[PDB]
């Protein structure tokens, strides 16, 4: 399918022409356009001025005005003589080296985007049609994944939340554990004392940094309010009626005030 | 680096500028065009006479050939630059491979590949007809455990058993 | 300090309550997860052949785009055929000898001498003279020239130094954009101090409910800093002057709306009178002239429907004037392109809202949303009379490219 | 539910109040949901990744292909840069003055239509060389393809007679038509006497290591060149159906035309609206169109020269009762030897490998008629054609 189909004739003709460019001045015995800047001589179907750049000696940090300029005048003089009749004086091939150089480019204003081509080859005018209509068709796909991708993010979000409460067992509990413990016995006192000791571990998860865990801040917040409730219960009891082991109740206000204003002391 | 280049222009190229510009009078006089079928009919073959059109034409061959001293190296430059329509449009045909073919068909087709054979259209029902069923397992595990325990061991602690009978009222509700 | 949670892990745990506590509620989260699993497999086979044929119903328009684009296959094989055969005529035309050192030697005489336009090396006259901090704000030499001189600092490919057979910026690239990005590192810290400074003036800018209009005219004084095409954030720094500088300066606007919007609380106590007006309605009706008018319904007076145009509008400050922080994201970083040329002229966005064709992400809408909904929570008369209120809230934002749809989904 | 009451029967297959067996029945439901979520898990994952590549390439080609046709906005709008600028010289006098004499092909048409008359009257014997082979013409890549290019120079009078359809004069295809009597059909049929005698010379038991090499080389050169040539003319009606039926059949004419379009929309008007999609410019440019039947339409006579020699070697009697596939399958062995010898000769055309299976139509159709009724030896009817079925399979690729 090279007649015509625009690709197999362009690959065969125009890409057999590419190796014809790769062996035009490179295989001219031997890389005569340069002074062996590349053995394979990339590319010689174009400049490739990082690969084949040795048309004369310098080629230096500032001496490209010295010898590469003298390469321009040197091979523009030797090619001013030899190219005056190589394709020069026989310039039907130079009338064709201006025909398929400028009039084919004049047809490339008609093979542009777009501009005043016909303009009824329909390419011309949406060159970003895959964005102009298929990001709009992909905006119908945004209506699709509006359901589905949001389902994926809330999906893995919920699974990650199961990981999150899976990553918090003594903490993110212990609101009802120490809360139910509170009114129960003393709270043991250990069910307040050791419970907010081993919870003061993870209350120092909520204190070795906090930003901005309003979850964990709410956790040790309710720990604080509950601890104040057993505080005012404790001195309310030992104050008003005052009937227990009095040294024990003063030990309760003592240790409970010690931890209570110890964390308020951290506040 | 200024890179001072000395081509053959403005002294060579003035012969292209002035002597190939004889076509304003020379090419309009002989009128050597429209079509190349003069002596295919074997009639005139001049016609007449393509000498002044060969003065402008040969002024493009020689007067723009001596102008092509270093310009037959340099007319000679958009062989790799007037193929900009050849580097892009076939790439647009490759894009027509990608967009007129692969974006639309990979879109709606490579979309529609994972289809029923989900399957889920069975199995998510079979998940559901398990799941809700397993729900009515555990709920009927609850209520059948409830009134046998609550009336038994919560004889004493009344108004804690009110919670239990409320939950039986829900579980059987 | 800011783990994989607090990215709406609050709003994740806002399924029912984090009110003591529960691992039971974690099981409840597993139940909602399976509910989403059947709703999303339900979306999957809903869209897998069915609305994948709905995507084939889209391929009417989209394969039609492949049909005008199939004329682009004919325009692409037409232009590629004219240039295929005409470029083959170029392959025989210029390469009559071919022998490109004898037939097309504009570049074989000049294998490096045709690429000899690299003389703008290197540094650093107009990098700090044409911009003191700036010299700009009149399409001036730091807008028009020293910006584009920093585009010459980026036109200089500072790691593509020599290729020593060419050797354009071998030692010129050692301090071209190191003095242009040293002096423009001083201009960069100048616009960073102008970002924390001018954005602290935007933190002082609290014009009219709320409105940060001083941050809008001040955002006109920041479009040149984000346009600034080198490029503009060379090391993610100009956007960090637009975002990481606005990190705390979101929370001045976010703290502003946070303390602001939650203060409109006022309600009734007991309305058996109005149920004697809708019991007095059906008494003298109908059978009479009605009675009701439509009568009260005292909730129709905007005790909470006021926020439906206010905290949906202040939510549209968390969203749609944060879509005027789509005039302040970088802005709208695009477009000036040399390096402040087009946005030297065109530095006036709307930005809100305005259409839907993009892909992006943003923030600064959490507490206004949770404030609007959690404020509206204990509302037991609504949403019976507020049916089309909360469903208009459901169907609020279709056509924008903002997260106001997710707000409307939160609504 | 309508499943749950049925599930209340399935768990009511445990008793009525059966809390231990209710627990175990719940473990059975856990097994069912367990495997249903294993397969629904991985199946849902494969579907999800299919959506991931689906939207990932709708993304990647929406953006990247929008920047591939918009990379054709970049490089093709870069095509519009030097439209009236390039080649740094008098290109206006190169395309209108030096290319004015490109519209002056008169004397080449007089000495080449006249030399196409006289020299192809000479090439009606010299490039139509035969009698007998002497390497098939001798040398039909010289001879029969000399009649192909002599018929490609007379494709100015064969194919570009269909391009020069009232171009500028009346005797360009009339006074040159008597110069095409000894010019076109003394070159095209000279390439078809050299082509039918080339493939017929390639149907000559060797045939040969230089006769079928040269002869088949002409019958692949002008065969595949004829195929891309008439494919360039059928793609001049398909590049005109792409082009002039985007102009005449825009639809904005909107009659369309009477009666040079529908029919012949789209051809549409030769020299050059109906010709330049197979003519200049046009770097081909005639299309060629040699030789039409070098083996472009004459590779069927090679595999049908072993499948007409093979079908001819039936001798339908069957000369004992079923010896049709003896000489016919012998011509199938000569079809494999001539086939692989000709693919060793000619890659593009002229019996690459189809002579084997064409001779399997000769042996297949031949053996399905020698014992069609009981007219052959009925006791030896199926053993013969079946013995050549499996044996002539095993004598080849089977």
Swiss-Prot record, chain A:
Modified residues (Phosphoserine): 120
Coiled coil: 59-118
Cystine connections: none
Main function: Component of the exocyst complex involved in the docking of exocytic vesicles with fusion sites on the plasma membrane.
Family: Belongs to the SEC5 family.
The protein's assembly and partners: The exocyst complex is composed of SEC3, SEC5, SEC6, SEC8, SEC10, SEC15, EXO70 and EXO84.
More details: Present with 3400 molecules/cell in log phase SD medium.
Record's protein name: Exocyst complex component SEC5
Taxon lineage: Eukaryota, Fungi, Dikarya, Ascomycota, Saccharomycotina
Gene name per UniProt: SEC5
Range covered out of full length: 65 to 331 of 971
Swiss-Prot record, chain B:
Gene: SEC8
Protein name per the record: Exocyst complex component SEC8
Coiled coil feature spans: 93-127
Function: Component of the exocyst complex involved in the docking of exocytic vesicles with fusion sites on the plasma membrane.
Subcellular location(s) per record: Cytoplasm; Cell membrane
Subunit relationships: The exocyst complex is composed of SEC3, SEC5, SEC6, SEC8, SEC10, SEC15, EXO70 and EXO84.
Organism: Saccharomyces cerevisiae (strain ATCC 204508 / S288c)
Highest taxon of the lineage: Eukaryota
Recorded family membership: Belongs to the SEC8 family.
Curated annotation (Swiss-Prot), chain C:
Spans traversing the lipid bilayer: none
Source species, domain of life: Eukaryota
Assembly information from the UniProt record: The exocyst complex is composed of SEC3, SEC5, SEC6, SEC8, SEC10, SEC15, EXO70 and EXO84.
The family this protein is said to belong to: Belongs to the SEC3 family.
Additional information: Present with 377 molecules/cell in log phase SD medium.
General function of this protein: Component of the exocyst complex involved in the docking of exocytic vesicles with fusion sites on the plasma membrane.
Protein name, entry field: Exocyst complex component SEC3
Name of the coding gene: SEC3
Residues of the whole record sequence present: 618 to 1028 of 1336
Curated annotation (Swiss-Prot), chain D:
Cellular localisation: Cytoplasm
Modified residue annotations for N-acetylserine: 2
Entry's family note: Belongs to the SEC6 family.
Role this protein plays: Component of the exocyst complex involved in the docking of exocytic vesicles with fusion sites on the plasma membrane.
Superkingdom of origin: Eukaryota
Organism phylogeny: Eukaryota, Fungi, Dikarya, Ascomycota, Saccharomycotina
Name of the protein in question: Exocyst complex component SEC6
Gene transcribed to yield this protein: SEC6
Subunit structure: The exocyst complex is composed of SEC3, SEC5, SEC6, SEC8, SEC10, SEC15, EXO70 and EXO84.
